[PDB]
Amino acid sequence: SRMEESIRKTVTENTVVIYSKTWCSYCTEVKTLFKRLGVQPLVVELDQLGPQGPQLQKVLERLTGQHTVPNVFVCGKHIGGCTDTVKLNRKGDLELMLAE
Ligand SMILES: N[C@@H](CCC(=O)N[C@@H](CS)C(=O)NCC(=O)O)C(=O)O
């Protein structure tokens, strides 16, 4: 699909991409973690896109294996959700990625 090719372009062009929903506490949490690191992520709020939201979500599951939000990409690579991102941070992998 065109939506799949567009996601690939979005995540290769933007250092941090968070596919989010505005009401989700885990999305807020991961937004805050990147803010504390000095990053300004690109946020895509899937609940604020009309019927494109659920279509995008389906393509995200095909690409990433995940059906929850947040769905986080760093340096073009899928990293997971909030707890995945927090674990990557706790290990210093997240900052090593950002540093390269
Ligand atoms: N363990 C996940 C949890 C994320 C989560 O539960 N997200 C909720 C929204 S706040 C969700 O996507 N729910 C949709 C569903 O369960 O299908 C993470 O750390 O990101």
Curated annotation (Swiss-Prot):
The keyword Metal-binding does not apply. Keywords: Acetylation, Chloroplast, Disulfide bond, Electron transport, Glutathionylation, Plastid, Redox-active center, Transit peptide, Transport. Changing residue 75 to S: No effect on Fe-S cluster incorporation or on glutaredoxin activity. Changing residue 27 to S: Loss of Fe-S cluster incorporation, but increased glutaredoxin activity. Signal peptide: none annotated. Glutathionylated. Induction: Up-regulated by cold treatment. Glutathione binds at residues 69, 82-83. Residues 27-100 form the Glutaredoxin domain. It is found in: Plastid, Chloroplast. GO terms for biological process: iron-sulfur cluster assembly. Belongs to the glutaredoxin family. CPYC subfamily. Has a glutathione-disulfide oxidoreductase activity in the presence of NADPH and glutathione reductase. Reduces low molecular weight disulfides and proteins. Can assemble a [2Fe-2S] cluster, but cannot transfer it to an apoferredoxin. Monomeric apoprotein and homodimeric holoprotein containing a [2Fe-2S] cluster. No in vitro interactions with SUFE1, BOLA1, BOLA2 or BOLA4. This is Glutaredoxin-C5, chloroplastic. It comes from Arabidopsis thaliana. The lineage of its organism: Eukaryota, Viridiplantae, Streptophyta, Embryophyta, Tracheophyta. The gene is GRXC5. The chain holds residues 67 to 166 of 174 of the full protein.
